[PDB]
Amino acid sequence: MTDRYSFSLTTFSPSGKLGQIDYALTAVKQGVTSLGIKATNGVVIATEKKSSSPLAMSETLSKVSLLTPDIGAVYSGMGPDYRVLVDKSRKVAHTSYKRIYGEYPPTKLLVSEVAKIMQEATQSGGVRPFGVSLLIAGHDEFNGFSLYQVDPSGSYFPWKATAIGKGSVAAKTFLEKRWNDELELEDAIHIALLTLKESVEGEFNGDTIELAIIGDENPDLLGYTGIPTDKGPRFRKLTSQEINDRLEAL
Amino acid sequence: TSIMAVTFKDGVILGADSRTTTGAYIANRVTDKLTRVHDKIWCCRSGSAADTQAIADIVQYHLELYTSQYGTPSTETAASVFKELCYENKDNLTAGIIVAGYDDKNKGEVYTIPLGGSVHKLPYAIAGSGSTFIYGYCDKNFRENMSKEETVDFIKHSLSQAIKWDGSSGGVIRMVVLTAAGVERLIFYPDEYEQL
Amino acid sequence: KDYSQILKEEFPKIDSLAQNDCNSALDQLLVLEKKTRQASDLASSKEVLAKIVDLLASRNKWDDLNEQLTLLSKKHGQLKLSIQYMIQKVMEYLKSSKSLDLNTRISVIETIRVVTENKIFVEVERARVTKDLVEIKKE
Amino acid sequence: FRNNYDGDTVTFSPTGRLFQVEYALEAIKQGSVTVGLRSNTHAVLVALKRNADELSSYQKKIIKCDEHMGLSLAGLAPDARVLSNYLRQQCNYSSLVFNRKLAVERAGHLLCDKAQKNTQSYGGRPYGVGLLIIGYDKSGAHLLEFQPSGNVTELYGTAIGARSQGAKTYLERTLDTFIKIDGNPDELIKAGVEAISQSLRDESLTVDNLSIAIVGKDTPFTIYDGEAVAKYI
Amino acid sequence: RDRRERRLIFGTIASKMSLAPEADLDSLIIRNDSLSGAVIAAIMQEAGLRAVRKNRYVILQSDLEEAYATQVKTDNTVDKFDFYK
Amino acid sequence: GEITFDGIGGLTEQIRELREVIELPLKNPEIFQRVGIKPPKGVLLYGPPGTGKTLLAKAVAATIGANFIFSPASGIVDKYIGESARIIREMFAYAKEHEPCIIFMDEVDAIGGRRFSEGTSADREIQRTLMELLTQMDGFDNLGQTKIIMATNRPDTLDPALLRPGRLDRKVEIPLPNEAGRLEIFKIHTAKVKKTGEFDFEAAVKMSDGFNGADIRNCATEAGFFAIRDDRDHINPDDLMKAVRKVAEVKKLEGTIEYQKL
Amino acid sequence: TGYDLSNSVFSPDGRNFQVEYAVKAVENGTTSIGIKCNDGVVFAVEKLITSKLLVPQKNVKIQVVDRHIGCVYSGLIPDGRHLVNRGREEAASFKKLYKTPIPIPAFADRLGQYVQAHTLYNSVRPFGVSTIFGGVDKNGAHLYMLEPSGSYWGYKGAATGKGRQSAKAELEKLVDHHPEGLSAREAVKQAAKIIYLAHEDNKEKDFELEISWCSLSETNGLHKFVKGDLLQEAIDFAQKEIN
Amino acid sequence: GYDRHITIFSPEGRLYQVEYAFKATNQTNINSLAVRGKDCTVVISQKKVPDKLLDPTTVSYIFCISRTIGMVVNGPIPDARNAALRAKAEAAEFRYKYGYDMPCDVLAKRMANLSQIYTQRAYMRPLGVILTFVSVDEELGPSIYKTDPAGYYVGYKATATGPKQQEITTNLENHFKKSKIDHINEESWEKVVEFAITHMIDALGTEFSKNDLEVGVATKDKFFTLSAENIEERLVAIAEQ
């Protein structure tokens, strides 16, 4: 059943750019401030959780999900659209790769498929574009450490250190002066805690802060070692109790 | 492969064995052919296991949708669901499942579904390979609205001969008691009924 | 059903059947009142329930009635004005008696939760019995 | 009210009654007038046949759906052809499956659902064609009028067209006439001629205009034209 | 206006208002968003108006949150809508 | 004196709301001074038409007995140079010598508009009228004792500068009464009117539901015509129910208000 | 406003105007009522007479779902007939798969999602009519009216159309008549009188009385239309009361 | 303007139609109270009392989706039954593909995405109701997930709806700060139901009878709803204190 022009994707701005992109970046500009940093020996990503009702449980809402534990993810954008995107991203990553190569998907191929999901919403008429801004942080054996930023416009670019949110304009200057390429993962974690704190200083504890890093392969996180060749999960989510341990030493 | 169900005054008990034979080899002796699609509705599976286990799982969520939407299912409502799946699939599926539930007003009800996929009412019913051997023994000793002790002894003596004559039926004898109290699980070892 | 209720309440009334009148009152209030207690439908409170206090007055000890008057306002009730109307009846017999009832007038204030705690928007009855408590402290 | 509300069949009125239903009735008044009645024996339909000029052939308003049934079109041409072909298959489908001829009472129920499909969904043209369906079954003669809204109401007789009030009024004087007349088709045919003449302005009284078709227990549905209708006229 | 600049208003007006130190005003300061000097003035005035019908002199906790819901009505949400950031 | 607080009954939920911000501060002003709150200045009375909003001015005036200034909207708009803004200055100037009392505004749909410029057709004199009303509440003169009663058909036509706090602090809605509120009104209209002791009580509310539910006085007028045809001075209780049923088809004016809450 | 120009649009009040105008469209049609008894239900509808050419007692707006359920509606006739035919295929499909008649409280569940879907799609027009149905199922007497918004609830009495509230005054009296409720046959005479009472403002046009009911103590759970001496007895009872 | 009626983004970058979905949630004005206990979950919702022509028993805001699973909806009732059938269909199909009891956290994810698909479609409109799912999880115990109509879901200690939700949320917020625990003592589920009624009456300021409320109960391996006699029995023990 098709009704007239309902697929119309005519909306355009007088400047030539898509108006749906500017309205998507505007909503993310007011949203909660996330960030991420790609260091030499590791990659760190951090974001602030949502308070809303004081009786809400922080364990229910998770702003960092897991696709396959070679790659981390964080989003400052649409909350609901992230759950739908991850569900579709996995099915595309499983069908186009895991149902063929049966391994962990590479970072370069996975980001290209996520960019298509945001495009299909813009390509297919009647469906609003995804207003999510995704930071895809992963470590492979070819490109090494890779930190990619997928904008709601549907394009992705690599970043050494970047931040998205309300303080994204101020944090962009902070990451240039405070962080350098010579700083390692341990140096980037302390910067991630200071940069994220400067956004909302109301509560700096680990209850409202979700911190996750991609380190070396941990054999305990996989649950089984029968093969010394198989590498363990590179993605490890830090407990909020462990976050407060680094805050006291910071 | 022997299954039977006999109603009595306070309810109905559905008997079955633990033996499942594939060809000349017994794969597993603890295999249970009983499947619960509802609390008060039970079914005894017989014949090809793949055909019965698939239908029992497909009907399992039909009564769940029927309970949360329409209402509490009866013995006739559940027995008709197994019938529709066996009507079109009669060539591709072999199901000797007997559908016997429990009701408060109507007491027990037993409906037998043969390979043809028909539903009819009988006070007592048997199916499987070992049923045809005791087929003449059940009709002679059957009683109308018997007690609970007479129901267990009637099912025990019937399944005892089905194991001796038919080699494909054997193992422990598991019973399900359906009455106003609830569901009760029973088991009998070969060291008991074989000597009776 | 109104005139039919007052006839059934007055049957276990004359002679009171020893002290069993307590079992012929609260039990009848549980069987009845599932309809009434709306606005004007009361066939017991302010009328029959007020006579129950006068029946137990000057008969048994006041420690039992103070526990019975508490449970009337403790569970549900409707309007405490009818209960506060019976409080003036209790203070009427205690004033004309006195003797060992001097300390009883103080116990009614503490036992009854209507005088101590808040129930309805009219607290005036709490201040009326408060002056009587002050006169006892002066003596 | 052009566009705004009620411009589409889906949009309703602030009163709640869609004006497109009332606007569909005006298409019947623009078409030709058709007068019809029935009795306990036969049923007569009198349809007016107009044209452009003398060289223009008069269009026959009576379309034969079944051997025992008949109808007439006072409305738009294309909307009836879809319905006439739909009802044509229903007569054969009932004879193929149920073996029984399509009932006049059962035809109006299935026809009622066909008119809503355009108003229920988006797009398409709703059916505003006036339809008078007759027939003879074991239940007797029946005439069910089809309104542009889709409602179907059985009457002894009625008329659809321009100034149909004049023909409906004549049926009030004869209300006790044609009902009591049984087995006499001559009086039933003469009642339809004087009924349409009251509504008409007396343009052309010739035999190329009035089209009379009768069905009953003996003579089935037959379309009379030319010298056949020239006996009464 | 942001969150911090409001306490210089609520705190100053509370000097002329009679209230208990047990008051819950340390909570609603977060709930307050998008206000002005004239709107806040009517909030403390409504706290005393409801205290008259409740037969209360000193403003209690029940005279704060109940009286705040009156003058605060502009739009349904007014605080970051509901998500979609 | 005609209608009193007992004739406006059924609104008691909103009646006790007005007497606290009107009768109390004009009697014992020290109650608001002890808490520290300032007395309310303006009071907004709105609602659906036919609920007696006009009678609210006469009901409050029949009790306090102080001075009252009625200032219709379209009566003060007479075109003159500087006079339109001067009329508002009058009522607040006379409030000091004549005592604060109460000032009343009757059905003002005009001055509360934004008034985009089409040429305005000489109505620019009304623009300075709105400016005078806004600057008066924010003026440095002593206020808060004088009560400003402003009634209107719908609130949105009023100036949003006035609706915001700082000028009009009181918005009092008069919606459709509940089932118990209408019952008190039937006894009011049937009091002075000669009736029969069988006059209906609670069934009149059940007869008309959603058609009107506001103006009962229409039913009292229609009930008199049924008794004339039957040659009776007293009203038939059955004819009283027939008059209520007639009102259902009398209005047909739509006017459903869900939008005037705020 | 502009919320009523497009179908299925959320208004600031919370309900679409077209949904609100769909309720007002029911009052433009005939008035149909209903009575829920202990062992069954009673249906009483009204059919307007256009002119003297109408054939008495032929077209019946009362529909019967299977043999155990009656179905009546009000407002637009064609819009309500399609909803009946939709329930005909659903009551038959449920009888085929589960081999059992459809229960009354779940009968509105199949039509509830059906009517609700018409208020969602843009190209699909919502329903503007109200439907009353009932009968005797395994669970006894039940009565439910389907609103054009897609909602239904248990109703001890049913009223719809222009005279719906004029009927509510009489329907609420049955509660005060007996605490257990009127019988099946006693409700037939009371449902007929309500039709004459709601027609006092409708006197501009004529009417015909059509009554149907289903009870376990008479037809053993079979819907039957009132005819014969039972119809003339209910008309004569209502004729003496309106005097 | 037209920007409010379009499904795509607005000039402010924020959808107005998502905000308009909450306009219909206040139509019924029902205040629901549900808390997470130790071994049990207590859910209490207001039941509007119509005239004598309606059956108050048939009127309910709480429906049984599956075993141990229940849902209370505050918003349009006709829109709730359409959403109730969607949750019941996904509950039975989940067991056929897996075979274990469907947890509440996952049931809140499925109904959120399906309600979110309606936001993306230009034809199907989003559900204007509020989806609150309650059950007793095996591993996680009692859990309450309130699904927003736009597809957002988060857990709450005590959920509250309606215009009076500010009274229920605040009164129950300070109660949880004194005990410093999200659960409730007296592990027996009989008195836990009575603890929620007292906190609801004190927050709303009005004592409701058995016909003014409905109380859902979620226990281990069982789900039911208290009848008129069971709800009346709860007010008896609460009255004595």
From Swiss-Prot, chain C:
For this protein, what post-translational modification is recorded in UniProt?
A: N-acetylated by NAT1.
Signal peptide limits: none
Assigned protein family: Belongs to the proteasome subunit p55 family.
Tell me what else is known.
Present with 5710 molecules/cell in log phase SD medium.
Annotated function:
Acts as a regulatory subunit of the 26S proteasome which is involved in the ATP-dependent degradation of ubiquitinated proteins.
What protein name is recorded for this chain?
Answer: 26S proteasome regulatory subunit RPN5
This chain's source organism reads: Saccharomyces cerevisiae (strain ATCC 204508 / S288c)
Please tell me where this chain falls within the complete protein, as first and last residue plus total length. 11 to 149 of 445
Curated annotation (Swiss-Prot), chain D:
Q: Which residue positions does the secretion signal occupy?
A: none
Q: Does the keyword Ribonucleoprotein apply?
A: no
Assigned keywords, A-Z:
Cytoplasm, Isopeptide bond, Nucleus, Phosphoprotein, Proteasome, Ubl conjugation
Q: Where is this cross-link: Glycyl lysine isopeptide (Lys-Gly) (interchain with G-Cter in ubiquitin)?
A: K190
Which InterPro entries is this protein grouped with? Ntn_hydrolases_N (IPR029055), Proteasome_alpha (IPR050115), Proteasome_alpha-type (IPR023332), Proteasome_asu_N (IPR000426), Proteasome_sua/b (IPR001353)
PROSITE patterns reported in the protein's UniProt record: PROTEASOME_ALPHA_1, PROTEASOME_ALPHA_2
Q: Which Gene3D superfamilies does the entry mention?
A: Glutamine Phosphoribosylpyrophosphate, subunit 1, domain 1 (3.60.20.10)
Location in the cell: Cytoplasm; Nucleus
GO BP term, pick one: proteasomal ubiquitin-independent protein catabolic process
> Got any disulfides in this one, which pairs?
none
Residue(s) carrying Phosphoserine? S13
Listed under GO cellular component are: nucleus; proteasome complex; proteasome core complex, alpha-subunit complex; proteasome storage granule
Q: Which family does it belong to?
A: Belongs to the peptidase T1A family.
Q: How does it assemble?
A: The 26S proteasome consists of a 20S proteasome core and two 19S regulatory subunits. The 20S proteasome core is composed of 28 subunits that are arranged in four stacked rings, resulting in a barrel-shaped structure. The two end rings are each formed by seven alpha subunits, and the two central rings are each formed by seven beta subunits. The catalytic chamber with the active sites is on the inside of the barrel.
Q: What miscellaneous comment appears in this entry?
A: Present with 7210 molecules/cell in log phase SD medium.
- Name-wise, this protein is Proteasome subunit alpha type-6
Curated annotation (Swiss-Prot), chain G:
The principal localisation class reads cytoplasm
This protein's source sits in the domain of life called: Eukaryota
Q: How is it modified after translation?
A: The alpha and beta forms are probably products of the same gene with different post-translational modifications.
Gene Ontology MF terms: mRNA binding
Protein keywords: Acetylation, Cytoplasm, Nucleus, Proteasome
Q: Where in the cell is it found?
A: Cytoplasm; Nucleus
GO biological process terms, alphabetically, are:
proteasomal ubiquitin-independent protein catabolic process; proteasome-mediated ubiquitin-dependent protein catabolic process
Gene Ontology terms: cellular component: nucleus; proteasome complex; proteasome core complex, alpha-subunit complex; proteasome storage granule
Additional remarks: Present with 12000 molecules/cell in log phase SD medium.
The UniProt entry's sequence similarity note says: Belongs to the peptidase T1A family.
The record's subunit annotation is: The 26S proteasome consists of a 20S proteasome core and two 19S regulatory subunits. The 20S proteasome core is composed of 28 subunits that are arranged in four stacked rings, resulting in a barrel-shaped structure. The two end rings are each formed by seven alpha subunits, and the two central rings are each formed by seven beta subunits. The catalytic chamber with the active sites is on the inside of the barrel.
Its protein name is Probable proteasome subunit alpha type-7
Q: Which gene encodes it?
A: PRE10
Whole-protein coverage range = 6 to 248 of 288
Curated annotation (Swiss-Prot), chain H:
Q: Which residues carry this modification: Phosphoserine?
A: S227
InterPro entries linked: Ntn_hydrolases_N (IPR029055), Proteasome_alpha (IPR050115), Proteasome_alpha-type (IPR023332), Proteasome_asu_N (IPR000426), Proteasome_sua/b (IPR001353), Proteasome_subunit_alpha6 (IPR034642)
* UniProt-listed Pfam families: Proteasome, Proteasome_A_N
Record's keyword terms, sorted: Acetylation, Cytoplasm, Isopeptide bond, Nucleus, Phosphoprotein, Proteasome, Ubl conjugation
Q: Which CDD domains match?
A: proteasome_alpha_type_6 (cd03754)
Compartments where found: Cytoplasm; Nucleus
Q: Where is this cross-link: Glycyl lysine isopeptide (Lys-Gly) (interchain with G-Cter in ubiquitin)?
A: K222
Primary localisation category: cytoplasm
Q: Name one GO biological process term.
A: proteasomal ubiquitin-independent protein catabolic process
Identify one Gene Ontology CC term for this UniProt entry. mitochondrion
Tree of life domain: Eukaryota
Miscellaneous note of the record: Present with 15200 molecules/cell in log phase SD medium.
**Could you tell me which PANTHER family the record lists for this protein?**
PROTEASOME SUBUNIT ALPHA/BETA
Task: Return the similarity comment.
Answer: Belongs to the peptidase T1A family.
Tell me, in a sentence or two, what this protein's role is.
The proteasome degrades poly-ubiquitinated proteins in the cytoplasm and in the nucleus. It is essential for the regulated turnover of proteins and for the removal of misfolded proteins. The proteasome is a multicatalytic proteinase complex that is characterized by its ability to cleave peptides with Arg, Phe, Tyr, Leu, and Glu adjacent to the leaving group at neutral or slightly basic pH. It has an ATP-dependent proteolytic activity.
Please state what the protein is called: Proteasome subunit alpha type-1
| Name of the encoding gene | SCL1
